[model samples]
Target: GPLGSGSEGNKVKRTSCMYGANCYRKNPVHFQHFSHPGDSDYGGVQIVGQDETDD
Candidate 1:
């Protein structure tokens, strides 16, 4: 059962929060909530593709 998830090798790019607010990206919670990308207190990581890299 542990060999089918296939999500252990995934990488995420996280951003820092501008204000003094705590984001879900840095915290783990089981509760349900909604977030907006335009909010200053909202921040999260993004999935990077194979071709996207620093040169």
Candidate 2:
């Protein structure tokens, strides 16, 4: 797979659940504005908002 570069590397990528109830990301620390109950499968931590940088 090709590696991410530039601002893409600096930005935190994110995705939401099928129902969109919970969002997920690799760097849970970046979700300072949201609360995380716990970690999801394969180290995909759950977040409240839809965006990784959502506040």
Candidate 3:
């Protein structure tokens, strides 16, 4: 079922809060979210600030 759809191999699990912000790159090969540091998500992984307003 789609509810349990996940990798059959080893999963590179990442921690994230249910209410935290979530974003990712435009490419499928770069499927990683950007969450704030110390935001109880992504294990304190700092998100790089890039002003892509013109992109």
Give all TM-scores, in the order shown: 0.21, 0.19, 0.21
lDDT for residue 7 in candidate 3, whole number 0-100: 45
The lDDT of model 1 is 0.35
lDDT of 1 at 19: 29
Could you tell me the TM-score of candidate 2?
Answer: 0.19
Q: Which stretches of candidate 1 lie over 4 Å from their true place?
A: 1-32, 47-55
- lDDT over C-alpha atoms for residue 1 of model 3: 68
Query: For candidate 2, lDDT tens digit of each residue in 1-55?
Result: 3355223223344332332445555353434323334523123344546566865
- Indicate the residue-level lDDT of 14 in model 1: 31
Q: Indicate the worst ten consecutive residues by lDDT in candidate 2.
A: 33-42
| Model 2 C-alpha lDDT versus the unseen true structure | 0.38
Please give the distance, in angstroms, between residue 30's alpha carbon in candidate 2 and its true position after superposition: 5.0
lDDT-best of 1 and 3: 3
Better of 1 and 2 by lDDT: 2
Give candidate 3 misplaced runs (Cα > 4 Å): 1-10, 14-24, 32-41, 45-55
Q: Report the lDDT tens digits of candidate 3 across residue range 5-50.
A: 5442224544443333454334432233333335333554334444
- Best candidate, lDDT-wise? 3
Error of 1 at 31 (Å): 14
User: Rank by lDDT, descending?
Assistant: 3, 2, 1
- The per-prediction CA RMSD against the true structure, in angstroms, equals 13.5, 11.9, 10.7
